[PDB]
Structure 1
Amino acid sequence: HRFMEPYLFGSRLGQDIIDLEQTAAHLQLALNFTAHVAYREGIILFVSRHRQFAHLIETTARDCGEYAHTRYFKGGLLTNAPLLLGPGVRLPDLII
């Protein structure tokens, strides 16, 4: 993809290699940001539409006590929340 050029260390025989030095910098902030929103009693949702880790991700959220959605994503879920879920619904404060 065109926007991933800065994050690529290089290409090895047609195979792109991701620069882990930039990954470590980003992952450090991502984990730090994830913990703080969990510290403040925030709702965290795990979203992953991939049919090889759906069970693993679903079990991962159960252990952490947080929510997961690895199934088919309905159209009006996050936007038209009152109709899909219920009258008064608290939207998730972070999505992974």
Structure 2
Amino acid sequence: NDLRDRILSEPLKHADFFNLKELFSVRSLFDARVHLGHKAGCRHRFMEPYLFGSRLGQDIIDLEQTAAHLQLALNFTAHVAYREGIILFVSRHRQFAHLIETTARDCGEYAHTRYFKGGLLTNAPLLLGPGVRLPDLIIFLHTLNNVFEPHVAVRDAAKMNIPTVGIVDTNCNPALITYPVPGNDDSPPAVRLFCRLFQVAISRAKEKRRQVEALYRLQG
């Protein structure tokens, strides 16, 4: 009992514990096109702070803020993975469907990229099974449905006390998402980037978990 408390509480004292600082740069995000938004016409009203400014009608995210945010997001993701809990990626976006499953399957994490049945998280035990565990963390690579409303899962995760980490875009509404990352959802370099990053954070959390378990076993 004592040493398990030790194993879980130890990583919280170190801001870097999974050492993700090196996993990207502002240059990196810059070549992954993250800094591009939609036309100023399609902008949401709640992106006004996260934006940098309008270049000839096209809006541009603040990459400094992107890094500050994404850091915290990835850190969070990791600390959940290490603590051995469910992670569910979600996107409706078609171009990237395959990626996101192919990503998630390799993380030992789950994706839901599909039509999203309505009562899914809200009414779990009826939909999924007689009693069931629910995603510990939900992670959106797009915040939208193909009809350009907010994906149900946002309202629902938020409804269920699940934390949420997702990429807001200039048109999207950030406000219900626990940890946002402002950034471009549309360009494939960007999706790929975010994919592989959450992938890696997961992998490192899992490895580090295994390790500290082995050390736990030598100490005993």
Range class of TM-score, shorter chain: over 0.9
**How big is the shift at 1:13?**
0.2
**How big is the shift at 1:93?**
0.4
Which of 48, 53, 57 lines up with 2:91 in the alignment? 48
Higher helix content, 1 or 2: 2
**How big is the shift at 1:11?**
0.4
Matches within 5 A, 1:81-96: 81-96=124-139
Deviations 1:7-58 (A, max 9, x none): 0000000000000000000000000000000000010000100110001101
Could you tell me the percent identity over the aligned residues?
100
Q: SS at 1:23's partner residue?
A: helix
Matches within 5 A, 1:27-66: 27-66=70-109
The CA distance in 1 between the partners of 2:112 and 2:134, in whole Å, is: 14
Find the structure with the greater CA-based Rg. 2
**How big is the shift at 1:91?**
0.7
Per the normalisation by structure 2, the TM-score is 0.43
Q: SS at 2:119's partner residue?
A: coil
CA root-mean-square deviation: 0.4
Instruction: Name the count of aligned residue pairs.
Output: 96
**How big is the shift at 1:74?**
0.3
2:10 aligns to what? Answer: none
**How big is the shift at 1:67?**
0.3
Deviation beyond 4 Å, 4+ runs, structure 1? none
The CA distance in 2 between the partners of 1:68 and 1:11, in whole Å, is: 34
The CA distance in 2 between the partners of 1:91 and 1:69, in whole Å, is: 13
Per the normalisation by structure 1, the TM-score is 0.99
The CA distance in 1 between the partners of 2:51 and 2:135, in whole Å, is: 32
Unaligned runs of 5+ in 1: none
